Amino acid sequence: ANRATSAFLDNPHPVGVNYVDEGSRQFVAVAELLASKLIDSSRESDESNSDVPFVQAYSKFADDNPRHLRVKTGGKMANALTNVIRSYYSINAPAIVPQVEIDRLASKATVSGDMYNSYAIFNSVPIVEVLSPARTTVSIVGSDRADVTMLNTGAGAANITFNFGQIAETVILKGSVPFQLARLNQPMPAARFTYKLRPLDGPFIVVLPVGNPLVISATAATRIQVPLAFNKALVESGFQTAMNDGLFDIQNVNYYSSFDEFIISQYHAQDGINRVSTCVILGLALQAYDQMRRALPV
Amino acid sequence: ANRATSAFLDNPHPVGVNYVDEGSRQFVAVAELLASKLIDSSRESDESNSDVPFVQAYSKFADDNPRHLRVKTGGKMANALTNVIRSYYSINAPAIVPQVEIDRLASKATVSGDMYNSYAIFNSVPIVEVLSPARTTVSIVGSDRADVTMLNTGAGAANITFNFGQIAETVILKGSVPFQLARLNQPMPAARFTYKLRPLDGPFIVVLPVGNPLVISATAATRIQVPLAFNKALVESGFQTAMNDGLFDIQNVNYYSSFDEFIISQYHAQDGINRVSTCVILGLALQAYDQMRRALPVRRV
Amino acid sequence: ANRATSAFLDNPHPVGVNYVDEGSRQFVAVAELLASKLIDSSRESDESNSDVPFVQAYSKFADDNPRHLRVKTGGKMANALTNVIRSYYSINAPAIVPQVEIDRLASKATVSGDMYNSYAIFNSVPIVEVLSPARTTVSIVGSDRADVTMLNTGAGAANITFNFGQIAETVILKGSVPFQLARLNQPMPAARFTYKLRPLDGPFIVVLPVGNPLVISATAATRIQVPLAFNKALVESGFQTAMNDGLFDIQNVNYYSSFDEFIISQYHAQDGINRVSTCVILGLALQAYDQMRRALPV
Amino acid sequence: ANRATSAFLDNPHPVGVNYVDEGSRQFVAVAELLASKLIDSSRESDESNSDVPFVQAYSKFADDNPRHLRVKTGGKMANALTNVIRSYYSINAPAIVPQVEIDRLASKATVSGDMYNSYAIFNSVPIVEVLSPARTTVSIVGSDRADVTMLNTGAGAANITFNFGQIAETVILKGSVPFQLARLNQPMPAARFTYKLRPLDGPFIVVLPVGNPLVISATAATRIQVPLAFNKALVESGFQTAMNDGLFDIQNVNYYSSFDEFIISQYHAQDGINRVSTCVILGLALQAYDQMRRALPV
Amino acid sequence: ACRDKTSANWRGYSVLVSRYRSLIPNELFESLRNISGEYNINPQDEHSFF
Amino acid sequence: FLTNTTYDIVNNDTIDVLKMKLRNQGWPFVERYNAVEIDMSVEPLRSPGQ
Amino acid sequence: MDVLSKGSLKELLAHLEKTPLEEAISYRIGTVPYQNVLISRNEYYNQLYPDTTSLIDGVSREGQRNVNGLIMSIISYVVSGSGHYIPNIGFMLLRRSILDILTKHDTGLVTNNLNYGIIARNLTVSKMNCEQRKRMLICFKLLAYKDGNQNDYEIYLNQNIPLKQIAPNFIPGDMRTVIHNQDQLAIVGIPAYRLTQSTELSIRDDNAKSYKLGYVDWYNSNSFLRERSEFNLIRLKDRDTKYGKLNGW
């Protein structure tokens, strides 16, 4: 028996334990609110002949008036937001920012700071383990769309077991040719192209006839509680920008292609519900980071 | 021996050298701003049950009050924008827009043609070349996520060299099974599922054991300077609309599946710094095209 | 015989023939003056806590107010200076600066376009040719140092000749071991370490002992008429910036390590008196380019 | 397959991670401005008969009125600047000056702590490796200008690989005799005296004629973001002054001839981005040190 | 004084111009686009107006 | 008025020269200012509307 | 635009006196003059609209470096409003007026070998309208008188009957002939007919309508000069007078 697993699910590194109190959650939400104003005021100032809207927005964000000679870095808020992002990613990262500065920055706006009032749908496909017989070769490629290519060289049909975890809500399986799939201790239905499964139902057995390689395409959906201000497009942009700026460079950590890939891996690891609580706050921080850095590039 | 390269990186056709001045950039920026008002006004007109906001916005865009029978298409601004888009794509384009029209259209709004205010992240994986030994087979598929499937039929373990170029900033590699990868003339680490690489570090060597094929999935992130009004979602839609309407059917040009692949391919070429500047202006113009054509639909099925 | 010549003296490409009239020379001088004020007003505004001095300097240079959320390139003057520099380097480079634009920009300040009211000393050493007999090898290295390594490996004296051209004023020779050098049909003097020479004197013939290799270090000085506001330190940095910025990227042109090598090479080519006139105007323009780019990086 | 590397690129020692905040960077900038006033006033007082302009400048710098009998040393500012310079060079320095003293000193003048509003060009040519084949001897000397001398004893022509560190912008190669140079798997062009190269392109191949030695002179330009008050002439002088004064004496620390080699060597380390930022702050502090020590010879 | 009076009393004149424009039919307005003219104002009248 | 000159002297003087003369004297009001266009609609009622 | 608005020979010849040659040069790369291209005209057709590029257009085009190209760029400026791209012309020529280039020997240009039939084909004459052809014949006549090839002008006119009928009648050296001319040479102007903002099919027609609509906006702009209302504000040099004379002539 051979075991094949998704590449993005192995060894999820521990996440930070700092800046998860109520005051810090307010600061992240306040950072998102003021960063949104910075982008909108930037477009308003560019459209018109006056830079007054930008000066007003930058003054609130950076606590100082912009100057022509100085580079518009972002002020104390920009420095604080960057350091908090590093702390979230890994427990090995230092907690540079004092709490007194965070509380002062959190007092600029009146926001709730609740990070679990809404939800979002995540598309990473968790394939915990695919168990195959001796004469069968199985390969898993991709995270957003998982292509499982299976070939058996034996004389008879082989039974391959799929395990999609207990966290995903629904999983859709599509094959190049119609195939047979059923739960444990259930009769095999007639060959069909598309299968819709609940991962909590149990391990799924797929029949593999000889020859004619069968490739299965998997798409999954998971629901994670996030603040109402969450925007997946802006979070993904912040993740790539922060990774390119070296905010995640630290010893003994795992690197992921997307925030979609990052949050699913932490969910499936031990102590996952408390892990995704911190990752959601990191997502909102990255959403603010993407907006602030686009308005103020360095 | 064998050399494999990405399909979208091969032979980038030259881009236009016209309408790249300060006045032309203002014309593109004005078109995007006025096209945005056109979409917003149409939504407001539907809510308020009155065509006044749309008639008022169309008058600013097209300098005319439409008649009932005559089809609304945008007038001179639409004509200039459509032809300038063609001129950016290739050298062979006619480039037949007078300077008087460009100056008049740029004076409609007080906006600046700044194409270096901000940045954007372009996720297309550049694989310049993958050099492999004689008894190994390498196939490269995909652009947004490149899947390199390599099979070692040879007797012993083989070394395959990866060249990701020098433009990309971060490349993340994942494999079906843990594999060994290190820089040129450096010790091989333990087998891991994921590697984070700087493409500037140098050619990378991967060890292919004898047996089952190894598939490496690749993801890249490149940062390119773009105007603050840049929106990647709108640019991609405009790129598809322009391709479908037949604005890009010029002789001796290359066709790309996305604006992501177009801008990266021109970046990975000689004088690519100058090519990217023209491609950025084309991106904002395509963004204006999508907004204007959605508010003024002409084609019916 | 064997011929050894300096590397930077070979094949000086033709120089630009545009923007050399009195009106164009006035604009370059105006650009240098207004760029100097920009770098001076930049320092004063930094110390004085107010941006008033910088705004006035930028308004004169760019004909528009400094505005936030703008690249702050430098207006039409920066574009005119960049395109003017490109035309100077090569005759194949297009000239795309309108004459009306030059006159308008030259009217900002009242300066004279005289390029012969002062002088500067250039330390590049023109080793035009070194003739050597058989069985002995000579190599010339460097542009400021000009270390020349010669080895005999022959019974008789080498008796080789030097040619430093008719342009350089003084050339100073030093050697690792003492040596004797004469003026063609002249009596060989006592072997000494140093020598002072006027290149107009004639070909200088030196003998080489059989025993050990001799290395000769040559330092030269040349006088070229330049405008009063000519700073060699600023021109050298501006020359390096222009090459990095890609201003000198025309095909079929020659590249030089520094401005002194460039100006000397054009001097020694046929029709060199007119070439240096264009080169010094390029030097003054490069001085303005460095000051403006350091004030407004792009 | 012998390996040849530049002397100054070997083992870049870590720099201090202290005094790199906004308040600290403000203190370094304030020191440079007040040092400029001190030296300028001393020149003014020497020119005139009165000594009041020096008295006022020293009162601001040292917070005490000068006295004829008592020695003038610079006061608190001199001690803090000397201590902060020690901390920057190495991570092993005590870094003893308090932060409260730093903040109080920085309040004397209103000056930005910006260190990225301008740029400077450095001439240290980086040659990380010159992979040489067998029967091929390669010697590389110099830092400002690199002299690479190579010999091929055997009959066959030899190919040598040049790697230039992919950090420099443009490199110009000049040879004693014309030589052929091309990139990997590119066609060989005709022999030329000079080549203009971009280190980012990749390793370069040089063919060797067998008869005679060929020596290549290399010059490189690299731009690094520096404060707008930067002066390379003053920085280099201060770098020598600090070295003679024993300011850089710390165990397990490498030494460099010039500040150009110091900043280039660290830029080629693994953490080049973070180290250069600290090195730039050291350069401005060195500029203030030279100006203050020349005004006050103690 | 001119600027203060201008800023305080610009809303009424902006509304007044709108009300006058609303009294003109489209056909009559298009004809008036063909005509052109220039009005001469004494300097004393202009300053007294603002 | 602001500069000591007569009409005959300032004749044949371009706009740019006159602006330079006034700015050196200390007079900043040497430029024209464009007016913003107010977008107006008339409700249809019986008529089509404008 | 300003050149295309000149109606009389006196106004056009006066404009060529003030305007330097640099306005005839474009400094923009343009594209190849003669090329079959597919253009987008979405107001009429969904399919791309075929057309052929020509030298007489409102856009820059590549032109030959010789004296032939310089003459052609001058004519294209007069008849179309935009010139050609001739790289690296000396500053002495660029500061000279257009009339001086066509009617003076001081400039170093040699035009004695000019062939009028070849130029008329390159600057496509079968495509020009009557006013454009009249302007071209003015340029040809000025070149002939400066060069002494007045016979070559007449042989060319005799080979083309319609050109001879519409050929402007003036002496390039006498001002009295210029004043007496009643020809109308205004490509752009105030239109008696109704002019809309719709696009046109051909490149020449669409480009011409851009100039036509631009002139109307320029007519109602503050830059336009109203003689009947501001005649006392005009400088004495630029005021309309009966005794106004060109230099020499």
Side-chain angles (χ1 to χ4, degrees), chain A residues 84-152:
Chain A
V84 175
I85 282 163
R86 325 179 93 126
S87 171
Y88 284 134
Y89 196 62
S90 187
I91 196 148
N92 313 317
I96 290 170
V97 192
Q99 193 75 11
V100 294
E101 208 87 56
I102 275 180
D103 294 323
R104 167 189 102 76
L105 294 192
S107 178
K108 288 181 167 181
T110 66
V111 311
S112 46
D114 162 34
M115 307 274 132
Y116 322 106
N117 37 3
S118 199
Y119 65 80
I121 302 270
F122 291 93
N123 314 142
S124 289
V125 184
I127 311 199
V128 174
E129 42 154 37
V130 167
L131 311 160
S132 64
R135 293 182 183 174
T136 313
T137 59
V138 163
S139 295
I140 307 171
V141 198
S143 46
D144 289 345
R145 186 182 100 230
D147 315 270
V148 189
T149 306
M150 313 149 30
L151 197 75
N152 79 313

Side-chain angles (χ1 to χ4, degrees), chain B residues 1-295:
Chain B
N2 295 327
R3 197 188 93 112
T5 177
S6 297
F8 85 102
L9 266 192
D10 188 85
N11 222 18
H13 69 284
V15 297
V17 296
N18 282 284
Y19 313 102
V20 288
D21 39 324
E22 191 41 68
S24 297
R25 292 189 234 117
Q26 262 185 50
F27 151 73
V28 172
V30 165
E32 193 266 327
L33 180 76
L34 293 198
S36 98
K37 308 287 191 29
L38 211 65
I39 279 283
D40 300 319
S41 37
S42 311
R43 282 290 302 108
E44 185 189 89
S45 167
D46 289 345
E47 288 148 20
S48 151
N49 196 358
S50 65
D51 41 358
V52 162
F54 175 80
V55 166
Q56 252 164 9
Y58 188 84
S59 95
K60 291 174 65 175
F61 194 81
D63 299 307
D64 80 309
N65 200 306
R67 295 277 301 265
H68 276 108
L69 283 140
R70 188 34 78 190
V71 53
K72 292 145 292 297
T73 48
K76 316 275 270 164
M77 181 104 77
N79 201 37
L81 185 77
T82 310
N83 293 318
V84 169
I85 278 163
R86 292 189 92 248
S87 167
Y88 285 142
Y89 199 66
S90 64
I91 272 289
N92 313 114
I96 57 186
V97 184
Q99 202 72 40
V100 160
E101 188 72 31
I102 298 269
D103 284 8
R104 202 190 44 95
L105 295 196
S107 97
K108 279 191 210 339
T110 89
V111 81
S112 56
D114 289 345
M115 311 275 138
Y116 311 111
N117 278 12
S118 64
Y119 62 90
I121 303 274
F122 291 91
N123 63 347
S124 269
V125 200
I127 291 156
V128 169
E129 71 193 324
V130 160
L131 306 139
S132 64
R135 293 182 183 174
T136 84
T137 281
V138 168
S139 149
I140 311 178
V141 74
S143 47
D144 39 40
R145 175 193 92 210
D147 292 309
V148 197
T149 167
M150 333 157 280
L151 170 64
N152 191 0
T153 278
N159 284 358
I160 303 86
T161 317
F162 280 61
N163 185 22
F164 293 108
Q166 300 102 40
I167 295 314
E169 264 158 86
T170 283
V171 166
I172 273 167
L173 281 197
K174 295 180 182 297
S176 37
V177 286
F179 62 104
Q180 257 156 352
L181 179 138
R183 306 181 41 199
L184 208 46
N185 310 329
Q186 251 194 247
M188 281 305 188
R192 308 142 50 189
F193 275 97
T194 279
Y195 292 89
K196 181 192 148 126
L197 309 143
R198 216 162 71 90
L200 266 176
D201 276 337
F204 301 103
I205 311 292
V206 64
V207 170
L208 211 53
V210 202
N212 283 299
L214 169 63
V215 189
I216 277 160
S217 307
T219 293
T222 320
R223 153 203 276 111
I224 303 185
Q225 296 195 266
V226 293
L228 205 29
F230 205 81
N231 191 351
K232 260 188 74 142
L234 290 183
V235 168
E236 296 324 288
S237 163
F239 191 87
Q240 303 293 10
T241 310
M243 207 149 262
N244 295 9
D245 284 301
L247 306 182
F248 291 164
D249 36 36
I250 330 178
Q251 44 264 60
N252 317 142
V253 310
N254 231 4
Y255 298 106
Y256 296 110
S257 166
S258 79
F259 187 82
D260 211 4
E261 293 161 52
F262 178 66
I263 201 153
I264 294 306
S265 191
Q266 310 282 339
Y267 212 115
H268 283 253
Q270 50 273 327
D271 70 91
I273 281 314
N274 327 109
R275 295 205 186 173
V276 156
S277 77
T278 313
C279 294
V280 159
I281 311 168
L282 172 67
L284 208 70
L286 281 170
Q287 170 172 341
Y289 195 61
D290 184 1
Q291 287 165 333
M292 152 192 104
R293 293 251 61 81
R294 287 196 297 127

Side-chain angles (χ1 to χ4, degrees), chain B residues 94 96-98, chain G residues 35 37 39 41 49 51-54 56-59 61 200-209:
Chain B
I96 57 186
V97 184
Chain G
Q35 192 204 337
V37 294
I39 84 189
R41 289 293 191 260
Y49 186 80
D51 207 357
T52 279
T53 49
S54 149
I56 45 179
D57 264 337
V59 299
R61 299 261 180 257
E200 298 237 45
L201 284 189
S202 192
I203 304 170
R204 299 192 331 112
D205 273 40
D206 205 24
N207 273 234
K209 218 209 204 181

Side-chain angles (χ1 to χ4, degrees), chain C residues 149-153 176-177 207-215:
Chain C
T149 296
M150 293 183 284
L151 79 76
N152 194 347
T153 51
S176 48
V177 312
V207 309
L208 205 74
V210 182
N212 256 336
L214 179 51
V215 284

Side-chain angles (χ1 to χ4, degrees), chain D residues 4-235:
Chain D
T5 190
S6 293
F8 62 97
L9 283 173
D10 155 35
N11 206 335
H13 65 274
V15 308
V17 301
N18 230 324
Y19 313 112
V20 286
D21 42 283
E22 188 44 52
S24 295
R25 263 140 47 188
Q26 214 169 288
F27 157 77
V28 171
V30 164
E32 185 261 347
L33 160 79
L34 279 195
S36 312
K37 305 290 201 32
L38 192 76
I39 183 156
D40 289 345
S41 57
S42 67
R43 293 182 183 174
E44 181 47 63
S45 283
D46 184 1
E47 161 211 321
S48 148
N49 305 298
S50 208
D51 61 356
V52 152
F54 180 86
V55 155
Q56 283 168 293
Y58 193 89
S59 166
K60 273 202 81 52
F61 199 83
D63 289 345
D64 47 18
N65 40 328
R67 305 264 303 200
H68 279 102
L69 287 205
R70 288 136 88 149
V71 72
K72 287 142 279 292
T73 77
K76 281 257 192 225
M77 195 97 81
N79 302 22
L81 208 64
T82 326
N83 284 7
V84 84
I85 281 159
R86 284 221 181 71
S87 151
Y88 281 133
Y89 198 85
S90 190
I91 207 161
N92 314 136
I96 48 193
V97 64
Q99 193 67 1
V100 184
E101 195 185 295
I102 287 299
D103 269 17
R104 194 201 101 250
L105 265 40
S107 97
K108 279 195 242 188
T110 73
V111 165
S112 84
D114 263 348
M115 306 266 159
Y116 318 102
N117 38 350
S118 62
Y119 78 78
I121 278 173
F122 300 101
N123 313 282
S124 316
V125 54
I127 317 188
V128 281
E129 183 178 2
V130 201
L131 191 55
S132 178
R135 285 180 75 121
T136 321
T137 59
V138 175
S139 149
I140 61 171
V141 310
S143 64
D144 274 326
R145 184 191 101 231
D147 286 27
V148 182
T149 76
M150 328 151 300
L151 278 198
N152 48 338
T153 84
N159 304 7
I160 318 187
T161 288
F162 284 54
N163 182 342
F164 277 100
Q166 73 216 10
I167 303 301
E169 280 144 51
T170 83
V171 182
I172 315 187
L173 299 205
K174 292 195 167 20
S176 44
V177 278
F179 65 114
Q180 323 204 0
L181 172 43
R183 319 212 268 104
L184 264 45
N185 318 308
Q186 294 300 320
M188 294 300 293
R192 274 153 42 200
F193 260 119
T194 166
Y195 290 62
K196 188 181 142 272
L197 287 202
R198 204 161 71 101
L200 210 75
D201 260 348
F204 312 91
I205 305 308
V206 189
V207 305
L208 260 171
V210 304
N212 247 323
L214 188 147
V215 52
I216 290 157
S217 316
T219 326
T222 298
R223 86 162 39 91
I224 289 167
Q225 277 135 90
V226 302
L228 196 52
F230 214 74
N231 199 322
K232 273 197 60 49
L234 287 168
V235 153

Side-chain angles (χ1 to χ4, degrees), chain C residues 21 93-95 98-100 103, chain G residues 22 27 85 88-91 94-95:
Chain C
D21 61 356
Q99 308 282 330
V100 195
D103 293 347
Chain G
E22 175 174 75
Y27 288 134
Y85 185 48
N88 299 326
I89 292 169
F91 86 106
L94 285 172
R95 306 240 193 192

Side-chain angles (χ1 to χ4, degrees), chain A residues 75-255:
Chain A
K76 293 179 179 179
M77 202 141 205
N79 206 34
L81 193 65
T82 53
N83 296 338
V84 175
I85 282 163
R86 325 179 93 126
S87 171
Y88 284 134
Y89 196 62
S90 187
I91 196 148
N92 313 317
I96 290 170
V97 192
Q99 193 75 11
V100 294
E101 208 87 56
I102 275 180
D103 294 323
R104 167 189 102 76
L105 294 192
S107 178
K108 288 181 167 181
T110 66
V111 311
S112 46
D114 162 34
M115 307 274 132
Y116 322 106
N117 37 3
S118 199
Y119 65 80
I121 302 270
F122 291 93
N123 314 142
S124 289
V125 184
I127 311 199
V128 174
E129 42 154 37
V130 167
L131 311 160
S132 64
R135 293 182 183 174
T136 313
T137 59
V138 163
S139 295
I140 307 171
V141 198
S143 46
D144 289 345
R145 186 182 100 230
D147 315 270
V148 189
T149 306
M150 313 149 30
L151 197 75
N152 79 313
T153 49
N159 282 6
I160 307 196
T161 297
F162 274 77
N163 182 36
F164 295 105
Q166 283 54 20
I167 303 301
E169 275 231 23
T170 75
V171 168
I172 278 153
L173 292 198
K174 268 173 295 243
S176 41
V177 303
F179 66 104
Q180 293 213 269
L181 177 63
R183 322 196 298 116
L184 264 165
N185 296 332
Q186 312 274 120
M188 282 274 142
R192 294 192 340 250
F193 269 99
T194 282
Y195 281 109
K196 186 176 148 279
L197 323 164
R198 301 299 182 144
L200 246 178
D201 291 348
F204 300 105
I205 315 201
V206 61
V207 156
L208 190 55
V210 306
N212 201 44
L214 171 84
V215 52
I216 280 171
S217 277
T219 294
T222 319
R223 204 201 301 251
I224 300 201
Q225 313 214 70
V226 291
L228 208 57
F230 207 85
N231 195 15
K232 265 206 64 63
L234 265 60
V235 170
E236 294 326 286
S237 192
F239 198 81
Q240 308 277 52
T241 303
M243 191 165 278
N244 289 9
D245 302 356
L247 294 197
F248 300 155
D249 296 337
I250 174 159
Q251 58 260 8
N252 318 128
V253 295
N254 218 347
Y255 296 102

